[PDB]
Structures are given as structure tokens and as C-alpha cells.
Write an enzyme that holds these catalytic residues in place. Structure first.
Site, PDB file in Angstrom:
ATOM      1  N   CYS C 163       0.765  -1.710   2.599  1.00 35.02           N
ATOM      2  CA  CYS C 163       1.263  -1.858   1.242  1.00 35.02           C
ATOM      3  C   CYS C 163       0.453  -1.104   0.201  1.00 35.02           C
ATOM      4  O   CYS C 163       0.846  -1.126  -0.965  1.00 35.02           O
ATOM      5  CB  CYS C 163       1.339  -3.350   0.923  1.00 35.02           C
ATOM      6  SG  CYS C 163       2.545  -4.088   2.031  1.00 35.02           S
ATOM      7  N   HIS C 298      -1.207  -6.438  -7.857  1.00 32.50           N
ATOM      8  CA  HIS C 298      -0.421  -6.254  -6.649  1.00 32.50           C
ATOM      9  C   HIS C 298       0.539  -7.420  -6.466  1.00 32.50           C
ATOM     10  O   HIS C 298       1.702  -7.216  -6.106  1.00 32.50           O
ATOM     11  CB  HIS C 298      -1.313  -6.099  -5.432  1.00 32.50           C
ATOM     12  CG  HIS C 298      -0.571  -5.674  -4.205  1.00 32.50           C
ATOM     13  ND1 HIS C 298       0.153  -4.501  -4.143  1.00 32.50           N
ATOM     14  CD2 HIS C 298      -0.406  -6.283  -3.012  1.00 32.50           C
ATOM     15  CE1 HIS C 298       0.713  -4.393  -2.955  1.00 32.50           C
ATOM     16  NE2 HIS C 298       0.386  -5.457  -2.244  1.00 32.50           N
ATOM     17  N   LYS C 328       6.435  -7.180  -9.240  1.00 30.83           N
ATOM     18  CA  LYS C 328       7.159  -7.512  -8.018  1.00 30.83           C
ATOM     19  C   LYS C 328       8.024  -8.763  -8.179  1.00 30.83           C
ATOM     20  O   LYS C 328       9.001  -8.922  -7.431  1.00 30.83           O
ATOM     21  CB  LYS C 328       6.194  -7.691  -6.837  1.00 30.83           C
ATOM     22  CG  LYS C 328       5.586  -6.382  -6.305  1.00 30.83           C
ATOM     23  CD  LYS C 328       4.759  -6.612  -5.028  1.00 30.83           C
ATOM     24  CE  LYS C 328       4.135  -5.301  -4.503  1.00 30.83           C
ATOM     25  NZ  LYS C 328       3.093  -4.781  -5.451  1.00 30.83           N
ATOM     26  N   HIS C 333       8.979  -6.291  -3.063  1.00 31.46           N
ATOM     27  CA  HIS C 333       7.843  -5.594  -2.464  1.00 31.46           C
ATOM     28  C   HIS C 333       8.369  -4.463  -1.596  1.00 31.46           C
ATOM     29  O   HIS C 333       8.826  -4.707  -0.476  1.00 31.46           O
ATOM     30  CB  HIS C 333       7.041  -6.558  -1.615  1.00 31.46           C
ATOM     31  CG  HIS C 333       5.711  -6.031  -1.205  1.00 31.46           C
ATOM     32  ND1 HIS C 333       5.346  -4.708  -1.362  1.00 31.46           N
ATOM     33  CD2 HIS C 333       4.647  -6.660  -0.654  1.00 31.46           C
ATOM     34  CE1 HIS C 333       4.106  -4.554  -0.943  1.00 31.46           C
ATOM     35  NE2 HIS C 333       3.665  -5.721  -0.493  1.00 31.46           N
ATOM     36  N   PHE C 390      -2.730  -3.430  -2.398  1.00 36.77           N
ATOM     37  CA  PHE C 390      -3.510  -3.876  -1.258  1.00 36.77           C
ATOM     38  C   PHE C 390      -2.598  -3.922  -0.042  1.00 36.77           C
ATOM     39  O   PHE C 390      -1.377  -4.053  -0.169  1.00 36.77           O
ATOM     40  CB  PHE C 390      -4.117  -5.274  -1.473  1.00 36.77           C
ATOM     41  CG  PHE C 390      -4.852  -5.442  -2.770  1.00 36.77           C
ATOM     42  CD1 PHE C 390      -5.812  -4.535  -3.164  1.00 36.77           C
ATOM     43  CD2 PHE C 390      -4.592  -6.520  -3.599  1.00 36.77           C
ATOM     44  CE1 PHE C 390      -6.492  -4.677  -4.356  1.00 36.77           C
ATOM     45  CE2 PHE C 390      -5.281  -6.670  -4.799  1.00 36.77           C
ATOM     46  CZ  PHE C 390      -6.237  -5.760  -5.169  1.00 36.77           C
ATOM     47  N   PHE C 392      -2.245  -4.924   4.507  1.00 35.18           N
ATOM     48  CA  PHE C 392      -2.737  -5.435   5.770  1.00 35.18           C
ATOM     49  C   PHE C 392      -3.846  -4.539   6.297  1.00 35.18           C
ATOM     50  O   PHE C 392      -3.863  -3.338   6.010  1.00 35.18           O
ATOM     51  CB  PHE C 392      -1.639  -5.497   6.839  1.00 35.18           C
ATOM     52  CG  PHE C 392      -0.661  -6.640   6.683  1.00 35.18           C
ATOM     53  CD1 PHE C 392      -0.861  -7.648   5.762  1.00 35.18           C
ATOM     54  CD2 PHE C 392       0.449  -6.699   7.510  1.00 35.18           C
ATOM     55  CE1 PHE C 392       0.036  -8.698   5.640  1.00 35.18           C
ATOM     56  CE2 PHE C 392       1.377  -7.727   7.385  1.00 35.18           C
ATOM     57  CZ  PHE C 392       1.158  -8.742   6.459  1.00 35.18           C
TER      58      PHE C 392
END
Ligand code: NA
Ligand code: NA
Lengths: 405, 76, 405, 75
Positions: C163, C298, C328, C333, C390, C392
Site C-alpha cells: 500500500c 494513511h 480513504k 483503499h 504504509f 504490509f
């Protein structure tokens, strides 16, 4: 700007599971290509591959490997190797904002994306998918799955550029060192090997199909009867380090990265233009005051590609005669892993003073005349070596590595 | 094998702990290092091992080795 | 050192198919989220998504679009807009070694990888796959499918970082300007929207499932009853240009990229550590001698992530934390495309002097108190803005953008 | 109407009008096909005539005529 050196490496490839095995294979001109019942059973016309001959069972802890596809497994094992080979311990590279990781794959995990979709469409639906498919199949899997367990606190992302992927990772890592942002960047990549990915290449007509009965002969760069590349899997990782940092800790230094080219053809999607590669090699050589002694060509064994690269080399070098060899004739084409693996082959040639042979040239292509294409293992004191990597989309990378002092 | 042995084998393999840590009192999260993804997969692995389907409401309560043993013993 | 500015925008998103449509949606707090019969039919628990409301069929020349998945189509349409917005004629950016492209996706094309595997296993086998799946599914599809038709001759690759993907693309574009290697780099990314990808997030428990009957209320960053992110697709592209080059040609300049942070948590694969984000924001703010007027968080609407990011903001800024909103909650997203899209929303806020609202906060989280989370569109002269992305694998990116002169 | 829809297939594949498609028109030298276009065109023909063309006979289809051979050479 800051100088960047290579202080450790690691590799899992079709021609060896560490740098000692790889070196022996390179010296012998040994093929890593075998027959694949998996590829044949899927219905493909190409039944040969460059497979990693390694049982990875239990080599990676459960809590770490649960997230990983094969690309990440190969890259992780390569990184373990490279850390040890660099002499680094956890207090030095873990939890350190000045230590980063740039490593990619060309395709993520086609296997686990297809697994996910198959499970979702099965009778148990969402419950069969499980919670680990995204980290296996996402494009950044190789970086994510390694930066987390190795406690990396610096840069952390993947570069992807088809068959140039891991070369651009190394070049990007060099840039981080040059900008003063990082002291060490682990750079490289991995790629899984599976019918789910390979069959799409066969459907393009890109893979070798005439030599299934003699797998070690199928990859045959510059031979007049080459008929496409042999797909391969594996990983590699190098430790890119700022020069003074390396010297201050008494590191072993393979070579300085003295050049990095990255360019774009802007032309054809699957065939190279030539002037893109010319500019890329020239960019990598700018300011390098020693001649290229050896050139690890990208040389995939396709009719369309091999000779275009040679014409580019001729334009760059003219009457100079860098020794040339295409190690994919031994190894096959590990796609996103190819760049770092070939960087490692070139560093081994530089470190051990030999030129690996360009094998299986039974009849040299008429358009490959006049070049110093080495077909027998040749001992020689090398000082400066170059490795090309190119990819679909007209993406080009060149790395130039040179002994320190 | 017995139900208890099969449950403990699954838990240890899933969570990467030695069998000696998989005691009947142990909590997956507080004692055996399970995270939220481990929880998903551990329910999945019990369902597969014992050819059973665990409703989410029941699975939410299976937070210890003993809880898993008790559930599987009670739902054959 | 060379300075980088943004001279052109383009966007295809769940809240608009160009920057004017997006501007209106942002000022209105308008949701892009709709009910998805496709997701429901696949067996998922989340039935809501941020879809692009545009039939792209036939919008790109057949010979170019044959190679492309949806991520590449969205990014391509975005790049056409950005080129026009920047006032760049073909002669100004095509066939130019100092003009590059860095753009990525988080996942390539799950749809076409699964298509290829389904076709291979069906009755026609290889003949049903066709020759275009590799360029659709490969991780570098977004860069490859754009650099080729747009005649890009400089850098050409994709960064992928889940992301954070397109934020890192923009950052790397800045670095190319700072290294003096390029005058213009097009930077951004794209992401397809499909059950093949989305079901693997549902299997992790990462998506909203309790608000399917009220799709526009499902994405609700900082709300006490948020329950996962809402998946979205789309694309975005920005023109990153060296300052003197932009001034000399009379470009319209939105903002200077005065900061770029990229760090790694080295901790948890799917949950943020917090100190990684703190270091990322601090790195992006270093040398920036003005306060942050607005922070595009984020803020994905997950229980795990939203307030970890707020705690990081509190640590960075102390009592002087900026105005914050999570776009968002309107847009969903878009994964790999999120960073560039949020950079663009931030630039529109900077260019038009307003803060977009953080919508759907019906009950503000207990841990979000004492902050300035903006919940109504607020006109304000902004000068310096910050956007977090940010992903994973513990990957972090921050961009800081500031008006010139 | 075999002619009409074959011209339509070839023209949508390659971007050529029915008139541009002649018996002697070359996919590659006249109508701009590359090697991937050729793969896709064989695909599209196999779909319309519900036939399976082997690699050996496919490799020899290069104009409208070399493929008219199949459409009505067999069916
Ligand atoms: Na090479
Ligand atoms: Na943001």
C-alpha cells in the site's frame, strides 16, 4: 558521491545452492537444465527448466515461512548466505535505520494467486483461502518477507522491471549509498518456478520447445538454431555497502560498483530496440577509466534478442574486444532473479580470475561474428566486468563492477 | 492417535512451538505467540484435521489448548 | 542539490475521472463506494468497493491496450491527463534520455494470472491463453505498458511496496532529479479491482463486512465501529520535474517535493510498529523550515492501523499536530495506487486552499482525542502538506509538498 | 458471409478495413502484424471456425488466402 562496494553475496540457482557450488558449475560449464514432468503435464510445449535442486523443508522458521512464496524463500536463503559472507551479525544490521533492503521478483507468485482463486471457488470458499495469500502473491513479497524477519529499519521496497528486476534493485541500492541515506542495502531478488507462470511464456512462443529430449542443450545463446529461452527459478542477494564503512570494519570487498545504467527503449513491448541498450551500457561506463574485460550478456537464447544485444555491444565498443559470455546457456532464465544472479556470476569471475564459457554454440550465428565470445573456461586476471539485463517493456539495466585499488 | 495428541500436534506445527510448550493450560495468544492471522489458520487447521466446521461464535472462545481439546471431544 | 517540483497531475479514481471531478468530490465529502454484486457473487463477506465509474473499453488504441491489465489502463489514462496538464508536447518528453517513468502496482493482475491458469487447464489449453498474459500480469506491467507507447527513453521500472507503492514511486522520481540523472520523471501507479484480489484480503479479515447495506458508510477512518478497509481501484500520475527546467519552460508548478521519507518497521508483517512511521515522518520533515499545515493520513479504517498512526503523529509533532483528514473514508483503499492518489488530493487541497473532510466519524475513537481531525470541508490557505502511505511488510513512505515562492 | 467476418476478425485484430483485406494481403507486410498479433489471429480464427489449427499448418497461414484454405478448405 559516496562509493558503493559489494561485501557479501548469496545465491540459490539452477547451477548451485551457494557460491561454492555455483563457482564449480561455472568453471565446468555445467548445465542446470533438467526435464520437467510438471511443465509437460500442464500441457506446455516446453518441457525443460532451470530448477533449484534443494529441499527447503525446515530451513526457515514457521512464523517466517508462513508468509512466503518460493521467490521469497529463495531470496531469504540467499540473504542468510550474504549476511554470513559479509561478516555481519544482528547487532550491526538489525534495528538499524542506516541498513535497508531492495529486492524484487518479476511476477510475485502466480502459483499462490491461482491457489487463492481456486480455493475461493471451491466448496469451502473463503475458509479455504487462508490468511497468507496476499503476502505470498503481492509484488513486494520478496522485500516484505525478508525486511520483517531480518529486522530491517532502513529502506524497504521492491523494484520490478521484468527480466531486469534484480539488476535495478542493485542499482537502486547503489543510489541509496551514493545519496548518503544508507550504509548497507541488501539487494537482489527471487523468482518461483511453476507451470502457472511458465505456460504464459509458452503461449507467447518465447520458450524453447525443440530440445526437450536433450534438456542440457536447449538453452543455446548465439547458436544458429536457438528457439527461445529456458525458464528458471531461484534467488540471489548482494550486500551493497558504503566504502568507508566497509573499510572501517575490515570487510571483504569483492568489487566496487563503478557504473549503473538504467534506460528505456520507448519502442516495442517484447523486442529490444538496440539504441536503448547502447545508451544503457554507455551510461554505466561513463567516468570508468579502465576497459571492460568481461561482459556477461543478457543473452537469453531467443532468435529475436541475442543478436540485437550483440549489435549494441559492437556499437558501444567498436574495435575493443571485451570477452563475452551468456551464462543463461548454462543456467536458464530466472526472470526477476536473473540480474542479481548474473551480477554474482560476474563477481565470482572477477574474484577468481576466470571467464565462464558460453556453452552449446554448435553453429555460431552468422551475425555473431567478430566478437570475443568465449566458449571454453578461460583463466584470466580480470579487473572490470559488466553485466547486462533487459526486460519486456523496453527496460534496460547495466552494472559495472571493478576491483578496488 | 487420540484427540488430544492430534490437537496438540496441530497447535505446535501451526505456531512453531515445541510440543513441551503445548500444555493444556496454554493460551494461544498469551503463551504460544499466536497473532490474528495464526488464529484464522489454526481454526482452519482444526476444521480440516477433524472434518468439522466450527461456527465463528464457537471459534472465538477457543483460546486455549484445553478449549480446543474440549470442543473437538464434544463435537464428533 | 537539485530540487523537484510537480508540474502536472492526472487521476482516475472512485471519486472522479479527472482532477476537476475529484476536486468537487473532495469539497463535497462525497463517497466513491458502491455495492458490488461481483464481490457478493464470489462468496465474499465484504460486498462494497471503490470502483472507477468509467467504461474504459475502446479508450486506448487497440495495439497498445492489447498488452494491458486494468492497473495499466488506469495509469495510462492518468498519464495522458498529466502530460496535458503539464503542457508537454510530444517533442518535449518523447524520445528523450532525460525523461523517465517510475510507476507501479501492488499486485500486478490477479485477474489475468487466474485467467491464464484457467485457460491453460481448459479444453484448448495453450491456445486459449494467448500471447498477452505476461505483460498484463507481470509486476512491472504499469511501467512497461506506459513507457513503451509514450516513447520514454530514461528510467523505466516499477517500485512495489504494497500500500506504499506509488508513494515510493514518487519518492524515487525525486531522487532521480536530485541525482541529476533526469529532468522529468512521470511517477504514479495503478491497481485493478476484482474479486480475484479482494477475496484474499477478506480471508485475512482485513475488509469491512458490517456495512454492506449502507456502502457509503463502510469506510469510516477513526470511527469507533470501523471494521476494515474498503477495497478500491484506480490510477494516478504526477509529473516530477527539476525546478530550473520547469521555470525555464514556464511550467505551472503545484508544489515542491521538499521531503521524502522511506523506512521499515522490521517487526510485524501486517500490523504497524509505530516507530517506523515516526522515523518516516521525521525523515520527510528534515530540513523543512515550515510547519505542516495539513496531513493526509494513511488512515485505512482498520481497528489495528488507524490509531497506531495517530500515536505516531502525536510523537512526531507533540502538541502542535497538524490538521488531519483520512480521504480513504470517501475513496476507499486503492492499494498500490493509494499513494499517488493521496498526493494528488493533497496537491488539490494545497492549490485550491481547502482541507477535505474526514467523513463517517459518527463516534470518534477514544484514542483519537485531543487532535485536529477535520470533519467538515474547511477553507484555509495551506503552504506545506504531508501525506503518509504504509504497507504490509512494515514498509513506510511519507511525502511533504510545499508551495514555491 | 465467410469473407465478411474474416475481414472483420483480421481488421479488429490489426485495425484494417474490409477493403484493405485482400486475398494477397500479407498480415505482416501489408497489415502491420507482429508475431504476437499472428498468435492472436490464429486464436481468433480457431474461435470462429470452431477448428483446431496445428502449429505446423498455422505457421503457413500468412495472407487472407493461406487461411481461406481453412475456413472453406475444410468446412
Ligand atoms: Na548479464
Ligand atoms: Na496519505
Amino acid at each position: 558521491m559516496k562509493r558503493a562496494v559489494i561485501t557479501g553475496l548469496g545465491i540459490v540457482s539452477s547451477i548451485g545452492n551457494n557460491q561454492q557450488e555455483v563457482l564449480a558449475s561455472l568453471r565446468e560449464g555445467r548445465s542446470g537444465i533438467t526435464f520437467s514432468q510438471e511443465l509437460k503435464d500442464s500441457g506446455m510445449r516446453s518441457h525443460v527448466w532451470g530448477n533449484v535442486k534443494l529441499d527447503t523443508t525446515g530451513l526457515i522458521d514457521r512464523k517466517v515461512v508462513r508468509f512466503m512464496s518460493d521467490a521469497s524463500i529463495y531470496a531469504f536463503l540467499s540473504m542468510e548466505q550474504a549476511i554470513a559472507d559479509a561478516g555481519l551479525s544482528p547487532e550491526a544490521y538489525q534495528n538499524n535505520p542506516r541498513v535497508g533492503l531492495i529486492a524484487g521478483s518479476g511476477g510475485g507468485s502466480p502459483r499462490f494467486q491461482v491457489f487463492g482463486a481456486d480455493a475461493m471457488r471451491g466448496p469451502r470458499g473463503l475458509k479455504a483461502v487462508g490468511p497468507y495469500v496476499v503476502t505470498k502473491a503481492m509484488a513486494s513479497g520478496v522485500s516484505a518477507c525478508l525486511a520483517t524477519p531480518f529486522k530491517i529499519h532502513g529502506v524497504n521496497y521492491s523494484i520490478s522491471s521484468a527480466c531486469a528486476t534484480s539488476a535495478h534493485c542493485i542499482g537502486n541500492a547503489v543510489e541509496q549509498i551514493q545519496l548518503g541515506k544508507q550504509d548497507i542495502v541488501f539487494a537482489g531478488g527471487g523468482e518461483e518456478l511453476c507451470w502457472e507462470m511458465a505456460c504464459e511464456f509458452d503461449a507467447m512462443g518465447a520458450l524453447s520447445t525443440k530440445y526437450n529430449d536433450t534438456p542440457e542443450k536447449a538453452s543455446r545463446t548465439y547458436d544458429a538454431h536457438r528457439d527461445g529461452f529456458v525458464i528458471a527459478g531461484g534467488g540471489g542477494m548482494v550486500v551493497v555497502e558504503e566504502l568507508e564503512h566497509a573499510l572501517a570494519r575490515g570487510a571483504h570487498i569483492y568489487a566496487e560498483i563503478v557504473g549503473y545504467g538504467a534506460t528505456s527503449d520507448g519502442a516495442d513491448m517484447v523486442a529490444p530496440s538496440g539504441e536503448g541498450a547502447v545508451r544503457c551500457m554507455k551510461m554505466a561506463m561513463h567516468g570508468v577509466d579502465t576497459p571492460i574485460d568481461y561482459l556477461n550478456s543478457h543473452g537469453t537464447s531467443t532468435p529475436v534478442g541475442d543478436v540485437k544485444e550483440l549489435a549494441a555491444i559492437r556499437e558501444v565498443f567498436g574495435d575493443k574486444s571485451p570477452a563475452i559470455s551468456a551464462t543463461k546457456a548454462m543456467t536458464g532464465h530466472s526472470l526477476g532473479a536473473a540480474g542479481v544472479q548474473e551480477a554474482i556470476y560476474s563477481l565470482l569471475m572477477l574474484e577468481h580470475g576466470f571467464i565462464a564459457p558460453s556453452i552449446n554454440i554448435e553453429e555460431l550465428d552468422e551475425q555473431a561474428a567478430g566478437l570475443n565470445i568465449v566458449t571454453e573456461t578461460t583463466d584470466r586476471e580480470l579487473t572490470t566486468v559488466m553485466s547486462n539485463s533487459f526486460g519486456f517493456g523496453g527496460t534496460n539495466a547495466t552494472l559495472v563492477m571493478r576491483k578496488l585499488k | 492417535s487420540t484427540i488430544e495428541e492430534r490437537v496438540k500436534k496441530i497447535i505446535g506445527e501451526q505456531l512453531g512451538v515445541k510440543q513441551e510448550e503445548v500444555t493444556n493450560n496454554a493460551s494461544f495468544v498469551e503463551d504460544l505467540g499466536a497473532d490474528s492471522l495464526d488464529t484464522v489458520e489454526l481454526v482452519m487447521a482444526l476444521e480440516e484435521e477433524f472434518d468439522t466446521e466450527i461456527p465463528d461464535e464457537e471459534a472465538e472462545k477457543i483460546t486455549t489448548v484445553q478449549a480446543a481439546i474440549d470442543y473437538i471431544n464434544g463435537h464428533q
